[PDB]
Design a protein around this nucleic acid. Structure first.
Ligand SMILES: [Zn+2]
Ligand SMILES: [Zn+2]
Lengths: 201, 201
DNA sequence: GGACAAGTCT
DNA sequence: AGACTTGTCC
């Protein structure tokens, strides 16, 4: 019963926040994150490991959801899905358990469930929260983005926001992280150009 | 029974040759033809009228066939079709009587038949030959191209040639014209840029 | 990693 | 029409 998913950040009572693994500063990296602009640059299909920080262990059954939304307040009501060209292309959507209409996927997990809202048609992927591996404190989730930010008919060059929520079994929103996501072929140069464009402006 | 349609020219015993009309020299023209390079520049979907020079009246039932082929000797055997993106797009392929997979269409003609080679898969559109309208010497066919020369999944930035053949009822190739075809959003500037890149090379 | 290429915004 | 943008070649 939520048409326009709320993008506004909300650190849950468990200090909800997401960070990233020092993506290779080189222009060759398959992904990179800009904390200044708070935007994630990722190559299509290429795996993107996300660090999730949890300060208070949540009630078991609690899960994390990833949902793509549109940043353009004019397209914010439109559902984000894979490109119509990519929705069919046998390259990746032919052997994966993930539906070919979902933009975001999760690599390396079977408990991951892909859901299509019946009333809102919103695509999203959820995974039950896992305890940080022995020794470390952050948990890691591997996400895939099966569409460039420029694909024709899908997200026609219009930016998006990735909504990572921390829900419980019934669906109560506890923590909510958000960041703009740009999927391109050269995440490095695009990040650089966006930061330099950020200063002199 | 022709896998790799022959591209080279072959005037028939009816002096087979194609020409064009005004070619609004301005860069705004939806289409423009270069006789120097012998290449056609056209905007996607926009109508391109082709003048067919018929010399000796051919046998009744004779038809003309437009077929797109790849100029790259590497992709030549690959069948040219609309990009998977455009094959779905509700833009044009939703109310037209032409298959959503065919690159070349004919506008303003119900006698036009769109055929897929069952053994080769080649797309092509055939229209029965019409007598030059009263008074004039040129018969005209209105062709449409529903895929840029840069679309994704289809003819991705690799050039093509348009094969216009004059066949009879059974299919004997009487006349065969050919010219490279570029579908872009700025046919004027691309024509100029190619014609200048021609001498400085 | 630089530069060409080509669709689109303004 | 000029120029930006962004995927892709080299
Ligand atoms: Zn796509
Ligand atoms: Zn197309």
């Amino acid at each position: 019963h939520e048409f326009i998913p709320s993008n506004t950040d909300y650190p849950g009572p468990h200090h909800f926040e997401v960070t990233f693994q020092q993506s290779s500063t080189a222009k060759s990296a398959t992904w990179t994150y800009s904390p200044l602009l708070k935007k994630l640059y990722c190559q299509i299909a290429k795996t993107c490991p996300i660090q999730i920080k949890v300060s208070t262990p949540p009630p078991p059954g609690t899960a994390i959801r990833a949902m793509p939304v549109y940043k353009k307040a004019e397209h914010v009501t439109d559902v984000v899905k894979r490109c119509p060209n990519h929705e069919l292309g046998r390259d990746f959507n032919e052997g994966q358990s993930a539906p070919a209409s979902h933009l975001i996927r999760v690599e390396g997990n079977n408990l991951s469930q892909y859901v299509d809202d019946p009333v809102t048609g919103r695509q999203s992927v959820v995974v039950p929260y896992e305890p940080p591996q022995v020794g470390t404190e952050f948990t890691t989730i591997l996400y895939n983005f099966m569409c460039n930010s420029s694909c024709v008919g899908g997200m026609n060059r219009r930016p998006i926001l990735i909504i990572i929520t921390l829900e419980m079994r019934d669906g109560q929103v506890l923590g909510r992280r958000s960041f703009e996501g740009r999927i391109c072929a050269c995440p490095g140069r695009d990040r650089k150009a966006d930061e330099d464009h950020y200063r002199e402006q």
